[PDB]
Structure formats: structure tokens, C-alpha cells
Amino acid sequence: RKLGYAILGLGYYATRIIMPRFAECEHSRLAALVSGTPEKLKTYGEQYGIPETHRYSYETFDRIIDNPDVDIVYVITPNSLHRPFTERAARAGKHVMCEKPMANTVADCEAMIAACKKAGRKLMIGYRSRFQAHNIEAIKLVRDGALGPVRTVVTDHGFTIGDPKQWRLNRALAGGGSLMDIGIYSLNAARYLTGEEPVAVNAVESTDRSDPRFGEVEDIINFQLLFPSGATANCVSAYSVNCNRYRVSGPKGWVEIDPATSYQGQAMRAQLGGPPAPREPAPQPKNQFSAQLDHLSECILTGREPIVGGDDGLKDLRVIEAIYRAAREGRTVKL
Template sequence: MPTEPAPVKVAVMSFAHVHAAGYVEVLKRAPGVELLSSDPGPHAADGELRGRELADRLGVGHVDTYEELLAWGPDAVVITSETSRHRELVERATAAGAHVLCEKPLATTREDALAIAAAVQRAGTVFMMAFPVRFSSSFARLRAAHDGGGLGEVFSVRGSNNGMLPTSRSWFTDPELAGGGALTDHVVHIADLLEALRGCAPASVTAVTNRVLHADRARAETAGLVTVTYTDGVVAAIDCSWSQPDTAPTWGGLKLSVAGTGGTVDVDFFGPSVRGLDGRTGRPIQLPYGADTDEAVLATFLDAVRTGSQPQPDLAVGMRTLDIVLAAQESAATGRTVTLAGV
């Protein structure tokens, strides 16, 4: 008979990120998981559902402080805070001996990223980045085509990650809390896919950004184009924006086009969906279907917690994808190409 998985106590630190609620729903269904959350205030005063009120709606236990949460003795924590607070929460979680799954991007500064790396090294705990798109079945098929030589020699990549302005969590548009805007939010996903697909280091980054869209609501860039040249000469162009209108039927999407001497593969990672119209309002409806990538991320993390193995994407991936973002920000500010030496 199959054995029950070893029990794991998982703490969710903060409900700031839009993925927090989805992770809670997955963890509630996961066998052998005890779950507790904390989301201390103060929170934004613009109607965002946070704290105990959100915990009650999600049906998850809640404590008022991180001290109480860590005193519970979690085996693992899921950090879904504002990006600028990742360092503090990783340091507190690892000091308590907990394994960490951290939302992307890793940090808002290189200094904070290095401090996170030092905290993880001191503790000797498992650390994993939450990059769900690399767990999709579409990416698995792309990877199989690439690894099997079906694309020949890859020479260029085009990626786009376009979404709605994230008004349900206003901190995403605050450069202090998020570290930037659409560039920070969206480039790391495609950078992670290229890391997983090709395993090649970035050599230089050139970027331009603007705030033409949503200028009255956003405090950071809302659109950008980032060009990454890798050490083997492959060039990747990444379109990142909050360009979906508020009336769009879905939050947005992520697409990748990989060109090689043997052919080109185009992937729409969120394309499979049922489309229709709302009979009451006449507005379009788009309901995606397919495997739950959040579920795959959390299953991988929980397995690593139980076995002590190091899952992917790891801390090094978080560091390298952040370096691309930081270089893109510098390039956009200076108008120059930024070289990444020894990343």
C-alpha cells in the first residue's frame, strides 16, 4: 500500500503577492501538510483584502505576527511578501531553520540578494524560487524539442509577458516596494525559462522603458523592451508591459518564440482556454485550462523539504535572473548596454 507523505508544517509569510491565495488553496489540498499564515499590517488603505480577513475567507489558520508564526515551528515557509521585504523574511525564516520557497524576483537590490544567499548558506536549508511557468507542459514539450536537437542551433529568442496593471495589489507599481514596475515584474519569468532551456549565462543587457500607459496610476515603468545577449551569442528580445486593458477577459499572457537552424517553435503558455461571452454583461470570458503550475511548484518544493534535496529553480537562478533585471534598469537609465561580467 502507498505510504502517507511525512507531515510538513508550512507557514505562509504575507498575503501581499497575488499568488498567495492560490498557493494557500493548493497547500490546503496537499496531503500531510499543516498550514498557518501571518500577514501583519499596516496594509494599503485602498480596499485590498489582506490579513486575518483574507485568511478567514481562504479558510486557513492565522496569527497576527511573524514571531508567533515562527514560534509555531514550521518546517518550511512560503514567502509571498512585497519584493523589498524578501530579505528580512528569508533571514528570519532560515534563522528559525525553515526551508524557503520565495516569490520572484529574488530581491530589489544586489545587496539584498547577497544577504539572502548568505542567510541560506548559514542555515543550510533548502531554497527554491517560485517560477511556475517552467513547470508547464508546454515548456516541457519545448525543452524536449530543444534537447532532442529538433531546433538545430538556436540563434534568437523572442519573448513577451504582457498583463493588466495589477491594481488589486497596488505595491506592484511602487518602486520602493517592488523594485521597479513592469520590467521587474515580467522579465524574470522569461529569463528563467531561458535559463532552464539553455543553461547559458547572460553576457550583456540593453533596455528601454516608458510610462506612457497608466501614467496617472502607476509610479514605475509600465512598458519596456529588453535585449539580452548570452555568452554563446544567442540574442533574446523580451517585451514586458502592463498593456492589457482593465476590461480584458484575462490578466494577460506569456509567449516565447525560439528560432534555430532547424526550425522555429512558438509557444503560448496560457493559450489553451475556453472563450465565450457573459450573458448578463456581454463582456468576453476566457477560462484557461490545463495542469496547475502552482501545484507543480509546491509539489516540487514539498518533496525537497521531505528529502533534503535541492530543487530547481534554486538560489543561483534567482540571482542570475535578478542580475538581468538590475542590468536592464541601469541600461534604461543610462542609455548604454550593460555588461554582466562573471555572473
Template sequence: MKKIRYAVVGAGWISQQAFMPSVAQTGNSELTAIVTGNAENAAKLADFYGIENIYSYDRYDEMLDADVVDAVYIALPNSLHADYAIRAARAGKHLLVEKPLAITEAECEAMIAAAAEAGVFLMTAYRLHTDPGTIEVLEQIRNGAIGDPRLFTSVFSYQADASNHRLKAEHWGGPLQDIGVYCLNAARHVFAAEPIEAIAMQGSGEDDIRFGEVEEAIAVTLRFPGGRFAQFIASFGADTLDTYRVIGTKGEMTLEPGFRFETDTKLLMRQNEKVVFEKTSPPVDHFGGQTAYFSDCILNGVRPEPDGEEGLADVRAMLAIERAAATGEPQKIDTPPRPGHPTPDMLREIPRTDRRLVF
């Protein structure tokens, strides 16, 4: 079986903890290159995973010109996504880019254009789009289990470490970009629509040195077509929690946990205040699932559902949310409807592994 060869661009925590261990589980993908600024760690990772090629960032174009990879997984700080993705696209490499896709609409559009011009696929790394728990929620809603979905609420929080690059304004860091994007993306697919207006507030506790450049927390209200509403809070300064609830005209469902990759999602559905359905998703590897799906798309010539436009839709909404928080005024959002949403054919139940090397 042909395997898609990947380069890991940015071998930091998320690559070490989640992406690199998952690739061998997929059956259709393999790691053949590492691009990183830490040569010592790269050598250890290459030896651990059997990766032949190691490149520093200043040799990135050399790696792209060599016939050693078919695709790149870009897990760099947000401000670097566009540059590294566009260079890879121009070299004919497929692009799996962590969210948020980029830091401006213009950068997102440039990435989309570069991929289209080169004839390669660009996929935003929305791992939950291939996750059984997420697909179960969306299928239940589509089948009318809770009637017409009217409200969405969510909280996603954890205590961010002071050394985390997600606390740096230069990289467009902050809780909205890091974890709020999950709440936003879930709401868009729950309602199968794009938000049309945003209201937001942000704030930080006193004397916390972590939040000199970005806010501690942000609270968001989104208006959707048909009088639907989504509200979520994302925080870097509260205890760990990730959950969301969808309330319809005939019932409601809660997914808790709902977003993290380390745990199985748990769905609870109520109608007339009585539990009518309860299900824990199978223990799958989210990163393995998204990688297996993307590799299948490449091998079969099928455009991935969470493409560049999907990433752009969230970036456009996040920028409106930021403007709303900064001005105290509602902000309009104008995004075309998506042609599709996550469906069962995207499911990839890849087994987890405990074999990983993390520094």
C-alpha cells in the same frame, strides 16, 4: 506520509488565488500558519482552510520560534523578501520565496548565506520549472527538434490596476520585475546559458497616473554566448498577452500562452514553415507543482534546482537591464553557468481546484 508544514507569509492576492488553494492538492504539504496584517481576512482564511495558527507581522519571530511550521512561503512585496527570509532561515525554516528573490545582489547573497549556514533549503518560486508545458519545450530543444536555438522573442503584458503594489518604486516594482522576469528566466533555460550583455529602453504613455513611479513598459535585448539573442517586452499598459518563440537553425516553436498559471500552455512547432508538432499541456496547478516539488526536496534532502543562486542570476541580469535602460549604454553581465536546468524528473502534475477564498 509525512507532510511539510507551511506558513503563508503575506496573504495577499497571489496567496489567496494561487498558493493557498493548491497546497491541499499536493499530498505532501499542508498549511499550518498565516502571517498577515489583516486579522479579519486571516480569520476567514484560517477557517476556510482549517489553519490553526494566525500571526500578525509583529509576531513573526514568535511563529518562527514555535514548532508550528517547517517552511515559509514568502509572498510579500519585493523589498521585504530578504528580511523575512533571513529571519526564517536563522530559525531553521526552509524558504520558498517569490520572485524576484530580492531587490539587490547583496540581499540575494545574504539570503543564500543564511540558508547555507542554517542548513535549510532556499528555493526561488519558479513554478514553471515543474510545469509540463515548459519541460516539453526544453526537452524538444535538447533533443534537437529545431536544431541549434539561435533566437528568443517574447511579449508579456497586462493592464495593471492602479492599487497594485507592483507600481511602487519603494518595493522595486515595475513590469520587468513582475512579468519580465518570466521572459528572462525562460530565455536563460532555452539557451542553457547566462546572458553576457544587456540593452534596454523603457517608457510610459502620457498622463497615465499609474506610472508616476515605475515605467509602463520595458523592451530588452540580451546577448548570449555563441551569438545568440533574446528580445522581450514587458508591459503594464497593454492588453493581456503572454507568449514566447524560439527560432532554431532547423525550425521554430511557439508557446502561447507561455507563462500564466490560469491557463494551459499550447506548443506549436514548425519546420520548413510547416506545422510538425502541436500539443496542449495537461491542466495542472503550477503552484501545487512547485510546492510538491519543494516538499519532496525537503523530505528527501535534495537541493532544489531553482535555488537561491537561480534567483540571484535573474536579479543580477535585471539590475543590468535597468542600468542599460537608464544610461542608454550596453551593460555587461557576469554570472557563472548554472549547474543544471529544469528536467522531467521535476514534473509534478498536481490537479487544479476551484476551492478558494479570495477577498
């Protein structure tokens, strides 16, 4: 009925966003905590009724293999740590939910996929937008042919990042800048809205290296995608402006969401045979976070593959590598 989650990395997303949302889950429960901060184990163990036997440090984490209440490890650490904790979780016989971006590189994703396959365990990447009501509505409008063939996707993701000392601005822990953290939503959306994989990539980077935030990673890196159908995407990724939106357009009309992939507050507008009008999406059973959690559990219960498996995360990293290359080399990169 309910599979047990171990949450690993008790930072902002784990504690403010994910852990409260087991409340609306139907097939998932909070079973264990893994943290490098003993104080957090006490604080959250007490809040959520997690016994000391089900609390782990990073030093004792591998012992989770012996805990049958844990089915899934949800890795919610800085990006460069996704690969080793995923592999350790897999060797501990656990299924894995891994936050985006999946890892720093293509090779690292391949390694993760291989370790989970070797363990005979499922791997899913935290693309919660695939469970969000408005995003699902947009995807379905496209698939139903409401727009005709997709011609353009224009999508902007970014926020004004603050503290220079934080791990996202540290290349060794983040793997890269805005593209790794928030621009990936633009890429991921261009992919699920078209339902295609890009065959050509352009990119331009713009970073003020005198800014205390941007000594190591990039601020803005905007990119263009071409798809086999002829569909195109213009994407923004930024750490110096606030944006969160996409519009997908075809000859028969368009639909947009703004904000598109935020935690809440989505608003959709469509232009489909008349002037633009607000469009309310079909109701979903539960919020995107609880839905994401239950999706992995239900896949395990039914022996099915997640809609956003390791291969989806790998496909993003492939294009991300090409985006960085296109900007570096000032040429169109073919995929």
C-alpha cells in the same frame, strides 16, 4: 511524508492561487498562516482548519521557530519585503519559498542566500513555469536538439496594470516596474530555454510619466540578450499591453507557447520539419502550483537542491540590474 507550509502575506496570489492548490500536493500541507490583517487570519484560518496556535501576525512571526508543524515559510509579500521575511524565516529555522522577483537588488538576494545558508535551510524561488507541462516540453525539445542550436528567443510579457495606488506602482514596495513584476518571465524564460546566462544586454525604456500609474516605476522596458553560444533574445516587458508568450527558434525549427506562463490555458505550436501544428505536451503528475510546492518539500525530504534555488533568483536580478543600466546609459552592458 508531508512538510508543513506557513503562508506569509495573505494577498491575491496566496489566497486565490496558492492555498487552494495544496489539494493536489503529495508532500506538502498547509500548516500555518502569517498575516498583518487579523481579519484574514480568522477568515482563512476558519476556511482551512488552521488553529489559532498556528496563526501569526507580522509582530509574532518570529515565534514560529517554536512550531514544529512548520517546515517551510512561503513569502508572498510585495517585493521589498521578500528579504526581511526570508531572513526572519531562516533565523526561525525554516526553509523558505520566496515569490519572484526574489528581491529589489543583487545585494539583497545575496543577503537572503547567505541567511538561509547560515541557517542550514533550503531556499527556493517561485518560478512555477519550470513545473508547467508546456514549458517543460519546450525546454526538452531544445535540449533534445529538435531545433538545432538555439538562435532566437522572442518573448513578450505584460499586462495592462490598473489601480495607480497599488504597491506594484510604488517604488519603495515594488523595487521597480514591469520588469520586476512581469518582464522577469521573459528574462527567466530566455535563460531556461537557452540553458545559458547572458553576456551582453541592450534595453530601451518607454514610460509616459504623465500617466497616473507611472510616476515612480517604468511601464515598458524591452531588452535584448546575447548568450555565449551566439543565441539571442528579444524581450518585451510592459505594464500597458497584454502579452504572454515565447517562441524559441533554431535552424531546424521552432516551438512557441501563447499564453506561455499564465495560471492556465497554455497552448503550444511547433514547426519541426513541416508547417506549424498544435503540440500537446507530455502529461505531468500535477498542476504547476502543486508541483512547485511539492518540489521544495521533496528536496528537503531527499537532501537535494531545488531546480530554482536562490541562485536562480540572483541570476535574474543580476541581469535585471544590467537591463536597467543599459536603458539608463543607452549602451550595451556586458556581463
